[PDB]
Design a protein around this ligand. Structure first.
Ligand SMILES: N[C@@H](Cc1c[nH]c2cc(Br)ccc12)C(=O)O
Ligand SMILES: N[C@@H](Cc1c[nH]c2cc(Br)ccc12)C(=O)O
Lengths: 528, 528
């Protein structure tokens, strides 16, 4: 019995120093935290994309203003994800192909669809599209962002006022160093540069101590595994099985690099690009003077040399001189994220391809659930079981959503895209698609107030993947309901007054397009 | 078998029938012909109905009926909480609270949400002090301001009309049914037919084709709404849908009720419903204007009808040979599926549970809200029916589990009834909630402590109907408390110290409202 006195974090990556900062802040003055980190071969900064709650749920919790960490991490702004060439056959190219008299792209923006007479705007859009009253795509009809993103507009005016929900693009290595300084200098976290040599467990299977290569022994009451894919504690020591979920996600490898960019000549894109490839997809994360890019592919349909060739040719890079990072990740999650006195945080717990910018979210979302379910020395099993339940739902819901990107793509030109259609959706995901086809919303938000959504982590965590996200991806790829929502035929006044709702989006599209500065213009004044 | 619903037939009148006619008539105004089949039954006494705050915001506001309009026409009173009397002390069934720890054996279940302090509900701070001997005040008096003003029969609104707390209403159901009958027929164009169902004609698909009445009239429709009560003329008799008896969780199955005249000038009016524990059940008291309704809900396995009538009459000093009494034998449980084919069951034809927590009328307009949200066309898409049945199934089962906890966790052991309740088993969903509760966790904590958002957004409340505030009121009120304080509080020394001002604010509101609020009788006099 007694409270947790000492906490040992194994691993000093991005997740490791987020755990040290979050736990150091949450338990300030009531727990001694030590982080074990061994020097590894450093890698390139291939870029990271995030979601709006990174500020409200993480940096706000630490008490760090957005401007403070943005300037020290050379971060850019992210307004949406631009899905390129997901509906047209062809090689992997950065240029959008032609589809129905226009470029093959669609946006997944932040925020929530507006409610009109208790019904999301998506249902009103499809009702018009189904009956031939409109041909405008879903994203351009219901969101104001696509128009200003086509012109690389900034999410904030020169006076600082924000006109849309946005996230950030940055190099994870810089944020890790920023949080390393914050945790050690402000929160009293102890940093130890050593390599784990032996993990000693007791008769109950719990971790007793960790011995390093130099002979130092570190004991604690609670151990946090941030060692990445290796899982030194949760997998190696605790012997907890890892659940491979490649029966839903075929991608398991990646080739990534960083490419210099002339922001003065071309501006900066306020969005992440997800460019469909022949055996996967390639991300593009614009930053300051450069952009990170990585080809996520499936080793079952493309060899590493084929992926390196495809990746370099699309960006006009020299495969013999370009610095490249070749990665082979494990897709899935542990059977239990928390076992005994060992809590897994980061890629040691779970991993999925960064198609929807969930990597960093998984860290501080798990850290949020860890503090909410924080135990004492008795390690109450109810706290551990409920934490493991939240983590498995957080990941499995994301896994199902990511699979829908490939499962519902109309492409059939390569074995990769054809095989994705041969996989089976999870029962929870298949039920969601059944609702969608019936004209229902999928996890409709309780309110269309984005400030409440992104300002209340509990409100968002219970409704992380909401109707707005599903319609952006499903309707963007071409999946639409079999027929309009049957209740709209009983709402003649609602379907008539909705004209002003679509007109309001058109007016904001025109006004913001004409008045907003470019992202490059704002970044220049922002970053000095 | 396509096209929108054109004709809707409601079988059964009363409260459920005319609530369905009003809600569906308003939602589908001008796009559906609605006919209500009602046969004259032997009328019963007005034994009183208790409600919850969303009755105005989710039902009457949807109809466009101001609170003052329907209150005056139904002679309604105000309800601020439920006072549970004699649930922790042994003895006969009496209206007088017994002595417990130097005070009356009662505790309140109030409306609203517990205030958050540093992201933690106030209940966790209360028990932390109680566990460490820092306080002896009961949970309800420490965290709620209502118990103090309810002990003095204070009004929930000042004489100037300003409301000082969340409240509901007390009324005779028959008056509300007549009010809605006039509203639906005169304002919404609903057709009322006085006839008795003679034969229900089904087709080869199992769907209802038409209904023939005793006079030979045949009524056909596209969608049928069963509001026939416990008889289940359509859902059970015609559709042959099985009814799931749940007497393994709730032993009460009978009731003896009446109405008692009351001199409001001499004794005032109680702004709360009373739940008076009995030897083989419990007795309600629903104060109204010049009278109060009362009913002894009991278990036929432990008390005969004559024993319950005697217990009921003796506690109110009534003549068992002359007092007008209503003897009822209800079915406890729910249908296997609330909606089958083109037949949707609404009201007690769908499910029933004892009115211990004032959920009877709520079940009607909550189901009507889910019916419109899942409204079908002539094709009757099975996904709409399946999702509706799931929402109804969760709505009742969660209520069933909560109601059982009232008896399961009562410390009384003096009668075979109370002893047998401890021999039943809680549902797995309820047992897991109790496991969390004992572990110091909240049970379905609200996303926000803003009651206006909660009671103003039916979707927000429906997803969190039984929240942490409700569970703590009943469980801690009966004496069930966690095994130890939340381990997370030991790491928040500043939070556990600054919470002193939160409890002091409740004490200041208790003192100020007690001195300035008028009595309910005083406010009712000026209003009515
Ligand atoms: N609730 C999350 C859901 C989400 C996860 N990844 C996203 C990426 C984009 Br682009 C838009 C939304 C999300 C949000 O609205 O930010
Ligand atoms: N969310 C519901 C829960 C509830 C159902 N019946 C109740 C009865 C009382 Br008294 C208080 C709360 C409830 C409310 O607070 O109105």
């Amino acid at each position: 019995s007694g409270k947790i006195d000492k906490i040992l974090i194994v691993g000093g990556g991005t997740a490791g120093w987020m755990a040290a900062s979050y736990l150091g802040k949450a338990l300030q003055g009531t727990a001694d935290i030590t982080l074990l980190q061994a020097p590894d071969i450093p890698t390139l900064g291939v870029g990271e994309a995030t979601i709006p709650n990174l500020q409200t749920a993480f940096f706000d919790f630490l008490g760090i203003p957005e401007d403070e960490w943005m300037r020290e991490c050379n971060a850019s702004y992210k307004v949406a994800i631009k899905f390129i060439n997901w509906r047209t056959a062809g090689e992997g190219t950065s240029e959008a192909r032609e589809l129905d008299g226009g470029p093959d792209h669609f946006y997944h923006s932040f925020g929530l669809l507006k409610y009109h007479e208790q019904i999301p705007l998506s249902h009103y859009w499809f009702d018009r599209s189904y009956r031939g009253k409109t041909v405008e795509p879903f994203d351009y009809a219901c969101y104001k962002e696509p128009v200003i993103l086509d012109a690389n507009r900034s999410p904030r005016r020169l006076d600082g006022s924000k006109v849309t929900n946005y996230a950030w693009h940055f190099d994870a290595h810089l944020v890790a160093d920023f949080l390393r300084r914050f945790a050690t200098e402000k929160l009293g976290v102890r940093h130890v540069e050593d390599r784990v040599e032996h993990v000693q467990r007791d008769a109950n299977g719990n971790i007793e101590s960790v011995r390093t290569a130099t002979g130092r022994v570190f004991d604690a009451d609670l151990f946090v595994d941030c060692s990445g894919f290796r899982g030194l504690l949760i997998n190696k020591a605790m012997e907890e099985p890892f659940l491979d979920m490649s029966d839903h996600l075929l991608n398991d490898s990646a080739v990534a690099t960083q490419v210099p960019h002339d922001d003065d000549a071309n501006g900066v894109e306020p969005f992440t690009s997800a460019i469909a490839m022949k055996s996967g997809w390639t991300w593009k994360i614009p930053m300051l003077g450069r952009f990170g890019t990585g080809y996520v592919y499936s080793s079952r349909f493309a060899t590493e040399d084929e992926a390196v060739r495809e990746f370099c040719e699309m960006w006009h890079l020299d495969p013999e001189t370009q610095p490249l990072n070749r990665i082979r990740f494990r897709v899935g999650r542990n059977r239990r994220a928390w076992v005994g006195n060992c809590v897994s945080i980061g890629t040691s717990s779970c991993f999925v391809e960064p198609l929807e910018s969930t990597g960093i979210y998984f860290v501080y979302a798990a850290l949020y659930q860890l503090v909410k379910h924080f135990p004492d020395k008795s390690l109450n099993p109810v706290l551990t079981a409920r934490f493991n339940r939240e983590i498995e739902t957080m990941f499995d819901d994301t896994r199902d959503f990511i699979q829908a990107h490939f499962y519902f793509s109309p492409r059939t030109d390569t074995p990769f895209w054809r095989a994705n259609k041969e996989l089976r959706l999870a029962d929870g995901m298949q039920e969601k698609i059944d609702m969608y086809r019936a004209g229902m919303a999928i996890n409709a938000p309780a309110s269309d107030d984005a400030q409440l959504y992104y300002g209340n982590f509990e409100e968002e965590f219970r409704n992380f993947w909401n109707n707005s996200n599903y319609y952006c991806v499903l309707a963007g790829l071409g999946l639409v309901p079999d027929a309009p929502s049957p209740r709209l035929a009983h709402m003649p006044q609602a379907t008539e007054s909705v004209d002003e709702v679509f007109g309001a989006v058109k007016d904001r599209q025109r006004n913001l397009l004409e008045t907003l500065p470019s992202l490059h213009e704002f970044l220049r004044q922002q970053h000095g």
